[PDB]
Amino acid sequence: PVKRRNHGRSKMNRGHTRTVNCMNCGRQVPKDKITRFAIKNMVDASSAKDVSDACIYQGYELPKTYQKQYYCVSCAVHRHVVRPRNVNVRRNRVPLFLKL
Amino acid sequence: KSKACGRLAARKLRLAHKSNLWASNAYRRSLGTSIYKTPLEGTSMASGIVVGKVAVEAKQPNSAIRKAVRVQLKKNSKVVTAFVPRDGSLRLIDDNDRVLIAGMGRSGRSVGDLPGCRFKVIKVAGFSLLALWLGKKEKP
Amino acid sequence: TTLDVDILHPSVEQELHTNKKKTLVPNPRSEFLSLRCPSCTGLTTAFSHSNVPVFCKNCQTPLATPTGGRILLADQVEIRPR
Amino acid sequence: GRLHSQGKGISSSTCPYRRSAPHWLQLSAENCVQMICDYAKKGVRPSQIGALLRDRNGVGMVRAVTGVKVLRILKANGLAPALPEELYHLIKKATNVRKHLEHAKHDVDGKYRLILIESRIHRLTRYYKTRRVLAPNWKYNAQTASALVA
Amino acid sequence: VRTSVLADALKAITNAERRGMRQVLIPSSKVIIAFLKVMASRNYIGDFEVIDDHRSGKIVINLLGRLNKCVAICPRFDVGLGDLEMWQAKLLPSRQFGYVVLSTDKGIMDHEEARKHNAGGKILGMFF
RNA sequence: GUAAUUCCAGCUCUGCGAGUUUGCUCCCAUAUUGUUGCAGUUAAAACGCCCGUAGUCUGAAUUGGCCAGCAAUGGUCGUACGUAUACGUUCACUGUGAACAAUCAGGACGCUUAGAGUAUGGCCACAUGAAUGACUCAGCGCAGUAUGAAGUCUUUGUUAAAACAAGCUCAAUGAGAGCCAUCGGGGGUAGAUCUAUCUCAUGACGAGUGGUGGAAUACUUUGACUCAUGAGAGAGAAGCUGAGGCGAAGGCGUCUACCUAGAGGGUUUCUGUCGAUCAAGGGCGAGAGUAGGAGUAUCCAACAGGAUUAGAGACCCUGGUAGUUCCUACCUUAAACGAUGCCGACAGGAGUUUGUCAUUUGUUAAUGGCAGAAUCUUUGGAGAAAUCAUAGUUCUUGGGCU
RNA sequence: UUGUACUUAGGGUCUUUACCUAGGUAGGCUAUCACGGGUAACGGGCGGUUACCGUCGGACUGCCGGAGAAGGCGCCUGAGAGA
């Protein structure tokens, strides 16, 4: 039977959509069907205090890298970006974070 | 809904009905005829001369050899296997006799364990097997 | 209150809120406005919705100008109910 | 807009509930017959004629003045158009879009919408030939398109 | 397209009665007004208001809450007195209530009327 | 398959009974042939989409109200004043009437009963009965007009000058056309633009670079790999990009000018049913594929090596032509999927959101209207269940077509 | 579909007609299924099965009407026969 009302596709009203690539498989997948906007620090954390001794320009702001990430279901599951879950909490369409 | 309901629409209903009968397998089997190219020829009972005696065996799970005679028919001059019921009975039949054959009683198809043959021997020599098996009539 | 609604004699609110056609008598929401530029003293009739940009006899500039719905009243101009 | 289309429209005028009136305004039965015939001399289609009276002479329903619809007034005086107005506009549209499909022939959306106008006309021309406005022998071709609009 | 009115309108009245409304809004006609009138005589319905809009019309029913289905069957089959008492057995649930509105030559009236007048005709539907 | 409640025998018991099994054909069982009366999201089953003829289907409107009702009817309100006591549309449909053996149903009668048969019953010469209905669609007559049809040549019709109020309804949350201000990756043509990749030329350096789970084939001091500038080529438009928009579906994302289509909204514009759905028939139709030109950067069926493996015609790696791009002809298929045909009505709340209008100075907003697009739910009903505001209104069975 | 469809004149017949022979037109039937093919097809009153609707069978059917006398074909006699 139908697992999801969505069918794993987030597209309504349109016959066709563009393809992207999971970063690991390199697989061609439609855009509609596991994206993450990803901010990491360019130096690191424990590297950063060793660096800031040797910096020309005082104080400074050590920059951040940005990356929009596209996966695919096979790639997403293997990396634990997504997992399977119980039939009741499949419906739960919000992420893990929660606020008051 | 899902069909024409209107007052003047009886040609659509009558003509569409004639098409849908050809899906039904019983109308299809009767009409094709389609039955003539059969050993029986559409006749319940047929007779003719025995060629010999053959052992054909059951499928699975039933391990047993069944003993069906080969019989040439009178009217077609074809040959066809035919089961012999009751224990003994192959011994009662004799070689090169006339026998009366009839159907397996399944309205076609192949019946029990026994594949292939669709035919049982009702009489031999104008007597009947039940009488012979029971032994209230005789053969020379 | 799904079961009880009084629909023979509804409120004055509910007639305005429902669609042009959906009312118990269907009849439109659009009327002929009287108009006046403070330049002239000549009192000009117009259809509120229009299609055509409205002029008085005397001046030159349109009194009202066309959009989708109601007329867009250019300048200081006013309406006398008659 | 339901005919050659996916979509369920509902958007149009609704006539006022009372055909008669209004006494408050001021118009005449004889004077309005002149004004309709005024514009029809200068080559306007009855779809636009009523609109000019609405936006110049505050005439809501023209029937509600005269007792008579606009096309009857022109045919009474004996000076309507020869083609119906809805038919005139479609063949004038269809000759223009066929002029485009000469120039660049790749737009199949032009071709798909040439049909669905050319189709609309053949429905209407049947209807008008039943009412005996156009004679049986009248036709619409590519060669005869520009002769009829002109 | 609206193929039929009397067919359509009696669906809407039934959907009110299942739900248990007090009143319903039906484009009106002269068979629908007579069909509602005949079931008003047998007291299945309250009392209703056939309003003007220089148009097709509207009706506002007032429901009494005593009614299970209005069918309106089509196509409109001809029926003639000797033939009729089949169409009671098919269409109605019981024998002991529920009526079969048919347009007799005299007018549209129940089966119970129609056999009294000795006039059959084409049938519209039923109610029970 | 050596403990047989189904074999072969005995004994007891059961059924039906002058009957009782066994073949083939055939109806019921079977709403598994569906007019009544099936089913089509996933079980078999909705054409890939749009036009479209035959076909079937086709909104409202026309002589009634009121009183006595138990109906048939009979009075009153309205006078509408043609033929000159009968004539002023025909049908379909309904009632009634004509017309047209046995069997079937059914009346009479104790053939001793029954299946049958047309008889038979009264002691004084008599009385009878051999009905009626159905068989039945078409064709024929009179009577009734609720529903459903046809009848109704008008830039002026019917019996010079008349008369008929001469006349052609409404303006449907049917449809078409017009007009107004918006909206959108609807389609086409042409030119720029932005990095990226590859190639080539110049300079710098000086042993590896690639690639992998690990390696090797591969390119490298005739200087690759990285770094910098410069020129060319063909392909593509990142991020914004979303359960967002448009398009009949297939499908459609830089910017500019050009020709082109239309949905939705608003409308006291116009016409007046012009419409719904569709065998044939006609076009559009992803990607692959074919034919002929123009290209050829990337990636790459085949193919060639290298690994791994028992083998590896594969998965992994290095190279690679056809194709991938443009133009002219073709092909006509996909999980062309909402696996849900199209038009129409009604039935429940809740807040999202796209377009646009309305009343407000909550004006890039609030509330409400139509038209989209999804969603949620302790709601009803449906379903085999999964689930579904349609897959609901369906043994409480009939809106219209395929 | 080529006497195939109409028309005018004739022959022939118990009469009417392409029934047949002439002259003159070029027509008729067809998606409301023509034409062609198949039938384990004589038609009908009716019979079997059934809750209704239907459905299968109908040589016989205790009757009605048609056709045939081993296979075509032809003819006399007669009110009537291709016996």
What's the helix, strand, coil split of chain D in %, to 5?
Answer: 55, 0, 45
Residue E55's region, left for phi above 0, alpha for psi from -120 to 50, else beta, is: beta
d(CA E53, CA C25): 6
Paired tokens of B94:
């004799």
* Cβ-Cβ contacts under 8 Å, C24 against chain E: 51, 53, 58
CA distances for A26 relative to A23, A40, A70, E68, angstroms: 6, 22, 10, 64
| DSSP class per residue in chain E | ----SHHHHHHHHHHHHHHT-SEEE----SSHHHHHHHHHHTTSS---EEE--SSS-EEEEE--S--------SS--EE-TTTHHHHHHHHSS-SSS-B--EEESS-EE-HHHHHHHT--EEE---B-
Residue E76: φ, ψ to 5°: -75, 95
Q: How many of the other CB atoms lie within 10 Å of CB of A42?
A: 10
Q: How many of the other CB atoms lie within 10 Å of CB of C41?
A: 8
CA of D18 to C1' of F71 (A): 44
Paired tokens of E116:
């009294």
CA distances for B67 relative to B53, B96, B117, angstroms: 7, 16, 11
Interface of B with E in 6-35 (CB under 8 A): 6-7
Paired tokens of B38:
């059969």
Output b/e per residue, E42-79; b: 16+ Cβ within 10 A: eebbeebeeeebeeebbbebebeeebebbbbebebeeb
Q: Evaluate whether E109 touches E101 at the Cβ level (below 8 Å).
A: yes
**Residue E126, burial from CB neighbour count under 10 angstroms (0-12, 13-18, 19+):** buried
Chains D and A touch (3+ CB pairs under 8 A): no
- Contact residues for C41 (Cβ-Cβ < 8 A; gap 6+): none
Amino acid (1-letter code) at residue D29? A
Q: Evaluate whether E53 touches D17 at the Cβ level (below 8 Å).
A: yes
d(CA B93, CA B98): 9
Q: How many B-E residue pairs are in contact by the CB < 8 A criterion?
A: 5
d(CA C59, CA C45): 15
Paired tokens of D106:
């790749």
D15 in contact with E at a CB cutoff of 8 Å? yes
d(CA B67, CA B102): 16
Q: Evaluate whether B91 touches B84 at the Cβ level (below 8 Å).
A: no
Match domain C1-82 to its CATH number in 2.20.25.100, 2.60.290.11, 1.10.645.10, 2.30.130.10.
2.20.25.100
Element (H, E) at C64: strand C64-65
Experimentally, the structure was elucidated by: cryo-EM
d(CA B28, CA E2): 42
d(CA D123, CA D105): 26
Helix (H/G/I), strand (E/B), else coil: B69: strand
Which positions on chain F have an atom < 7 Å from some protein CB?
A: 1, 7-8, 22-27, 32-42, 46, 50-53, 55-62, 71-73, 93-96, 144-148, 153-156, 168, 170-182, 185-189, 237, 239-253, 259-276, 282-285, 327-328, 338-341, 343-349, 356-359, 368-377, 385-388, 391-394, 396-402
CA distances for E65 relative to D10, E26, E61, angstroms: 34, 17, 11
What do you get for the CA distance between the two ends of chain B, in Å?
73
Neighbours of chain E (3+ CB pairs under 8 A): B, C, D
d(CA B56, CA D58): 105
| DSSP class per residue in A27-77 | -EEES---EEEEEEESS-SSSHHHHTTS-SSSS----EEEEEEE--HHHHH
Q: Evaluate whether C39 touches C59 at the Cβ level (below 8 Å).
A: yes
Beta-bridge partner residues of C35? C44
Q: Evaluate whether A67 touches A38 at the Cβ level (below 8 Å).
A: yes
* Cβ-Cβ contacts under 8 Å, D17 against chain E: 53-54
> How far is C-alpha C27 from the chain's CA centre?
13
Q: How many C-E residue pairs are in contact by the CB < 8 A criterion?
A: 23
Resolution in A: 3.3
Q: How many of the other CB atoms lie within 10 Å of CB of D90?
A: 20
d(CA D82, CA D77): 14
Residue ranges of the domains in chain E?
Answer: 1-67, 68-128
Sort strands E108-109 and E102-104 into parallel, antiparallel or unpaired: antiparallel
> How far is C-alpha A99 from the chain's CA centre?
21
Helix (H/G/I), strand (E/B), else coil: D38: helix
d(CA B121, CA B130): 11
d(CA C37, CA C42): 8
* B12: nt with nearest C1' to CA: F56
Domains of chain D: 26-80 (no CATH), 81-150 (1.10.287.10)
Element (H, E) at B68: strand B68-72
What do you get for the CA distance between the two ends of chain C, in Å?
41
What do you get for the CA distance between the two ends of chain D, in Å?
29
E68-128 topology per CATH = Dna Ligase; domain 1 (3.30.1490)
Which positions on chain G have an atom < 7 Å from some protein CB?
A: 32-33, 40, 52
| Radius of gyration of chain E from its Cα atoms, rounded to whole angstroms | 14
Beta-bridge partner residues of E119? none
Helix D70-77 crosses helix D46-55 at what angle (to 10 degrees)?
110
Paired tokens of B49:
């001369």
Report residues 30-89 of B contacting strand G, contact meaning Cβ closer than 7 Å.
33, 36
Q: Do E23 and C3 touch (CB under 8 A)?
A: no
Number of domains, chain B: 1
d(CA D38, CA D53): 11
Range of the domain at B98: 1-140
Beta-bridge partner residues of A66? A39
Cis, peptide link before residue E75, omega less than 30° from 0: yes
E1-67 topology per CATH = Ribosomal Protein S8; Chain: A, domain 1 (3.30.1370)
Q: Evaluate whether A72 touches A35 at the Cβ level (below 8 Å).
A: no
Residue ranges of the domains in chain C?
Answer: 1-82
Q: What single-letter DSSP state applies at residue A20?
A: E
- Count of alpha carbons within 13 Å of A26, Cβ hemisphere only? 0
Nearest to C15 by CA among C28, C30, C34, C1: C28
Nearest to D93 by CA among D12, D43, D148, D11: D148
Beta-bridge partner residues of A37? A68
d(CA E74, CA E69): 16
Residue linked to tokens 């050319």: D118
Residue ranges of the domains in chain A?
Answer: 1-100
Beta-bridge partner residues of B45? B102
Interface of E with C in 98-127 (CB under 8 A): none
d(CA D58, CA D17): 18
* Cβ-Cβ contacts under 8 Å, E74 against chain B: 5
CA distances for B45 relative to A65, B37, B42, B72, angstroms: 93, 16, 9, 13
Helix (H/G/I), strand (E/B), else coil: A8: coil
Q: What is the CATH number of domain A1-100?
A: 3.30.1740.20
CA distances for E21 relative to E15, E60, E64, angstroms: 9, 12, 9
